[model samples]
Target: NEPQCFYNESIAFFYNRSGKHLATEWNTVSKLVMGLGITVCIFIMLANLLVMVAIYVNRRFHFPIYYLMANLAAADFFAGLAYFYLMFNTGPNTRRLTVSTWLLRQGLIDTSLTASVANLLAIAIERHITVFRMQLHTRMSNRRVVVVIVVIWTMAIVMGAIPSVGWNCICDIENCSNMAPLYSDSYLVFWAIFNLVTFVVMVVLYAHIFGYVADLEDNWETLNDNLKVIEKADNAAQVKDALTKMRAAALDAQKAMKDFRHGFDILVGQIDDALKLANEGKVKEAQAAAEQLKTTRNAYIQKYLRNRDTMMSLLKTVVIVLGAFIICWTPGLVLLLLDVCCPQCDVLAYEKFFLLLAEFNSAMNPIIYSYRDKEMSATFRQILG
Candidate 1:
């Protein structure tokens, strides 16, 4: 009877009562981190809104890709709003919150985040289809774009509404406002697999995009070479047209080359110098110039092989954006899944760390777009001006 009484007391001691501080687990460091996170979320929301407004007002960016970008901006904006609610409600000084309110906020955040990912995936598929199916791309009207965006949001709403409507903490108030124990194991497993599948699809689509672009460039170069050969046997009009195509293909191929140290402009200049020396009948000077060319090539090769600090690389902008998404979201997703699926995983013991990482994803998209897109950058400047 004594042991049983002690056991009951131990269980009662750990039980969470109503009106308890939602952020009781938060300490000084966590408070500061949460404060910073809220500030960042506000900035991200405003910046993304500015981007959306700029794109909407500008005639130059009224295309399909920009439309998708606006969708992403809206998603991130709502994500920021959700994060703001969470920060305010979970701060140390907050009043008692109801379970329904807490779950609603969580659902909003999840919906926005899932919508953001779905937007990215749609963008990838759009790019892939547009680049590969040139004829079909012409039919991708604005109405179709809108329909796609709606579908993405519909899916996100369904995924997010599941937790709030179906498998929520309302029945279990003891685990209410708690992340780890809030949902059932089956729900957690399904959520984890859902995100994992979407991530995999995005990766595969981007990989195919890269490969297709590379192959298209190569095919253009080969066609240009064949057209050049045909130009010699054709008339003046055909020859001139062939020359134009050849120049365009040459420039495109040069841009695709990975060895940026020896740029197309530099290579052209070197070739002109070598030709001038050869035309002067200076055999020795031409040989010396040839040696210089070889030396320059060797120098470029060495420089290319060495590690560099420049943000300039051969990687595509889409690849970089996908990498940022992975970096910002993967840790939080994995931790959340483990916290729910693995009983031994004590992720709730930590505060404000993984959640902060998840919130960071909302802030990174505009930075990526501005840096990678010259048109968007100029528009940003004009908007700020």
Candidate 2:
């Protein structure tokens, strides 16, 4: 019955004649694949560490968003640690390790993944508030950010500990005994629902934000044109008076133009970076750059030239990021949900691979955060090099 199990002593897992499934022997190819996974794990750890260190060591990066990103980097670094555990110990079958050890590693992975996702959601919310509600964003303190990070990690730990405490299906031989530690039906269902809801909220928020930005940019253009037309149509007496005023303000105007030009160049560069990322199919980077573009453009308008014309590169950046997140994560999330809802569907073959794709999101965060950030790039190179 059950195809007569065979156990490999080196890897310590039971397999059947199904030709080296996850629980079976590790063949040359499987070992090679695992090796590659190990390499990725190490890379994630080191790269995210560098990201965190760069933020921590520099006072210039001491912004609310950077703090959130630092927490996210920590989460990802720990995620790599969990992957190391999964790679070397207790294969598809955890029977070789003690129950406590299995639960510990499972909880570690769960907590790390949950924290990473929550931190991203936090970053999105922070961005939305900053861009949409400027007053509130300004009033937000570093203490608030710290509290948010605490809550994110606290909730993640609680969620991760659920299976360890009681909800585990480990003892349920009929339903989930054969599954891996993280594959418990209750946990899978919970995680899938959580990700789905979080993703939907992010989509809605970004949509609203981009819509507002597009309208604002259009209004800026219309108003700037009207001002120019009005200025040009002034009567001769009015023109003479205005010329006298201009002569008096010549020095101020020159300084203002200098500032405007500097800001304008920065905004244009951001647009170019967004365009490049979009063409290269880097959705997150483009979207993030677009957001920064909008924020920077608004600041430039307020500080230097309120009625000046600025490019609408931010809009394109938003479109790419919005599409990219859905494109990359939606399929994997849906497949995860399907697997949970239909046990007989046997989605495991594709599940492991797609799950990695989802984890790849963690890898992309620092890249997105630092995109087109000249000071950050220079600092990172200095520290890492």
What TM-score would every model get versus the actual structure?
0.67, 0.68
Candidate 2 has an lDDT of 0.60
Instruction: State candidate 2's TM-score.
Output: 0.68
Clashes of 2: 0
Model 1, residue 216: distance off in Å is 3.7
Model 2 lDDT tens row, 171-219:
4423442235324666667776887788788778777776766655554
Show model 2 residue runs off by greater than 4 Å: 1-24, 90-95, 133-140, 177-183, 226-329, 343-347, 369-371
Runs with alpha carbons beyond 4 Å of true place in candidate 1: 1-26, 91-95, 135-140, 172-178, 218-315, 345-351
**Who wins the lDDT comparison?**
1
Cα lDDT of model 1 by residue, 268-384, tens digit: 465456445545654445445545545665665565444321112313555676687888677767765765555544635544676787777678888887887776788888876
Candidate 2 least-lDDT 10 residues: 10-19
- Spell out the clash pairs found in candidate 2: none
